[PDB]
Ligand binder design. Sequence first.
Ligand SMILES: CCC(=O)N1CC2(CCN(c3nc(NC4CCN(C)CC4)nc4c(F)c(-c5c(C)ccc6[nH]ncc56)c(Cl)cc34)CC2)C1
Ligand SMILES: Nc1nc2c(ncn2[C@@H]2O[C@H](COP(=O)(O)OP(=O)(O)O)[C@@H](O)[C@H]2O)c(=O)[nH]1
Ligand SMILES: [Mg+2]
Length: 165
Amino acid sequence: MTEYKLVVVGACGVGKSALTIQLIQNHFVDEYDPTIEDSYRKQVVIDGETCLLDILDTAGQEMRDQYMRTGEGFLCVFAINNTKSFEDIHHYREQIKRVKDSEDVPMVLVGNKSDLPSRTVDTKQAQDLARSYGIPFIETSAKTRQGVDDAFYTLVREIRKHKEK
Ligand SMILES: CCC(=O)N1CC2(CCN(c3nc(NC4CCN(C)CC4)nc4c(F)c(-c5c(C)ccc6[nH]ncc56)c(Cl)cc34)CC2)C1
Ligand SMILES: Nc1nc2c(ncn2[C@@H]2O[C@H](COP(=O)(O)OP(=O)(O)O)[C@@H](O)[C@H]2O)c(=O)[nH]1
Ligand SMILES: [Mg+2]
């Protein structure tokens, strides 16, 4: 069983906890406690490989540098109806680059809440940013579970592309 250490980063309220809960439990949580920062496991077969995913759901206030230093891949999450959350991505990416001392860190940009009407961040802005960074862009809904598996599996794939597993 190969382990993958994943970290989910991004602003409060973008749906980090809700995505993580969906992947594991196939349940959408309407409110999940914003101060619960924890680590979750999921055994999944991806491309004929039994993976044990170790997902840190970041939370709390602004041991951290430990998961950040050793995490193999990062989900950088904004909400499509939260312009500030999107603007914040630059900071998360910068800081991840710093800790890894690398422009090439396995990462996926996730634009969540795709079910909500009238996005304030359009797919073009999100694609432009992902392209600049050399990373995939995936739109999700934790509410409906759409793109949720795609985000996490694509991250596992970006990790493999970077390093032997
Ligand atoms: C509602 C509760 C919830 O859901 N939360 C998730 C939550 C968001 C706030 N968080 C962070 N915020 C800020 N800074 C600010 C100031 C100005 N900007 C523009 C935006 C935020 N920096 C952060 C940061 F640098 C890192 C980080 C990175 C990337 C890389 C290596 C690292 N080593 N050590 C920290 C760190 C991490 Cl991991 C989080 C925050 C932490 C975790 C709280
Ligand atoms: N419509 C909708 N609401 C969502 C989605 N993801 C999360 N939410 C809601 O947005 C709020 C913040 O979600 P949460 O998962 O706690 O975000 P976090 O602060 O980044 O962990 C919660 O009320 C969720 O129910 C989504 O895809 N769609
Ligand atoms: Mg949370």
